[PDB]
């Protein structure tokens, strides 16, 4: 099955799939490449491109007097391993295209410019290109701005069903040293009595819950120190990650985990925070909930469940803005191999878009 | 100060260490290099060289009808990091001698090698090659003969004491597998409750006692696995030792390591065991013990206190031999950057190992 508005996202998806935009290492500049792709892409909209640097560079474009501002990122996370074809040349099968960033998420952005050339309705996009590593820029500068919108949509893969809660996250970077002057001797032995009381920690928080998330998603992702079995290792290396329901008090779980290491941490660095969405106290979370949950209502989306993932809608609702997270696609099939997102999902979300910006 | 067997024992350990016999690699043949050196500087001894393949070879040589049996391993562990000049090229200072394997343990073998020379006494030498890593078969191979010695004496840093007894030794390699099909979805989780276990346990044996020595020495030595904070890892390799004391149960000890990873460990593999000298029931040990201790008065050796570290002379006294560790230097500067072992212990043990070849 074929429209003219699924065959023109499937276009603009193919050259967007073209462009490396992969992060790390963020070589994104704001002159040639996609943006200047972009540029062209939009008629009628007054189009501003923002570089804030060091790969973080924004498009912003406004058609007529839009109440509602579509966010997507258009970074995308490295390739591989495993990719059975050039990641960046897009392929289509009988149901479903393949390609880095597909599915999340230039699928959402070549539907939202498939849109745009399709009517003139009022329309404001903002493409950022540093939502998948740290050193984020765009959103931040944007929000400086104090722009008035009615509610930000953010894409991200949502199975085209509006989202209107998700986790916050942090990831931490711990090192261990050895204290000569000992139960302490091994830091490997201190890691080890760490994780306990971490894991042990999570589990007492598992009956914490919000619309359907239950506890805290916790992750120690690497481990790395040590030479030999029986040679006392003098450093260690752990990284790990938690996703806060809305509400957590994270700065105290934070400092909990802190507090685990006996004796401290030689290193202790969050390296990412993200707030949950919304964030704030119990009340302030239900009430921007509810007001997304009207949005997606009078966009007439259907809302899906709360995820466990991380956006950068989190920042909006922060800034003050209603925000919802809405996109093509299963994240099931982000950061994978042979990356996918199907033909069913990219006509539901552009005929969904368009609806929004040249529908009656 | 200076005496020729002092400089003749130095000289025969400049051109000893000169020879390189870092294992790994365990580049070691029987015919040229090392053993053709040995060869020609036993004078009046029957001389046999084995070769057990793969740079296991052993020396046997033998003068008159000895009592006793002195091994030596001739291989070093690997050199660096650090090293400030060529671990090859013995340094000299005015109390001291630096090079790979001074102390452990070709100053023993130069100083047995400077008696040889000093008078034509009744003496029986081992020298092997297979001493410091896996894969050993000089020892093994040489029990097999069943020749009859009243004593072993096996050469390591017991600075010119007599030791009596020593810990055994277990290294093992763990692999944790993540289970997708859940609190076992992380192979770092895995591997976090197991080591909370192993700890815990070592702390319940540390009370266990022999000859001053205390509880079960345990030793996480390396854990790798993971690539990011947030990301589950699906595999974690974790490397493990333990001393165990004589008379311990270490088939028991291995298994309830083992038992303590739930679920079972995608690999358990120990890749080394040695026993405790002595070994057996703690009557047998102490008998033994004492066997060694007779013959240490015996020989006139002052005798040193049990040590944490491992030898051969565990698979001597197996096997049914009374034996005992003495060599010169400290075992603190075994496998260390510009290893060193004073002229002073040089001198002692070689006045004493003369004394008991050439010796009214
Ligand atoms: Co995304
Ligand atoms: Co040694």
Redesign the interface.
Known sequence: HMTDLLASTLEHLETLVSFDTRNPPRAIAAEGGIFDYLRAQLPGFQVEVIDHGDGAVSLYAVRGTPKYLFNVHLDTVPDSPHWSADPHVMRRTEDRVIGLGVCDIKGAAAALVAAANAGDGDAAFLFSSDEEANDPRCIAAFLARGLPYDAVLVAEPTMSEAVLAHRG?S???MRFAGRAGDPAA?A??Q???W??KA?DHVESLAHARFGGLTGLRF???????????????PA?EL???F?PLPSMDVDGLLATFAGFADPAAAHFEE?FRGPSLPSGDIARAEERRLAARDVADALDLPIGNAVDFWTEASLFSAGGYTALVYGPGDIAQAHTADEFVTLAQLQRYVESVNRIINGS
């Open positions: 996250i990831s931490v970077l091994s490997l032995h890691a080890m009595r994780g306990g894991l992750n120690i992702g690497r481990v790395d120190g040590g030479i030999k079995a029986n040679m006392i290792a260690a990284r790990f990650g996703r390296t």
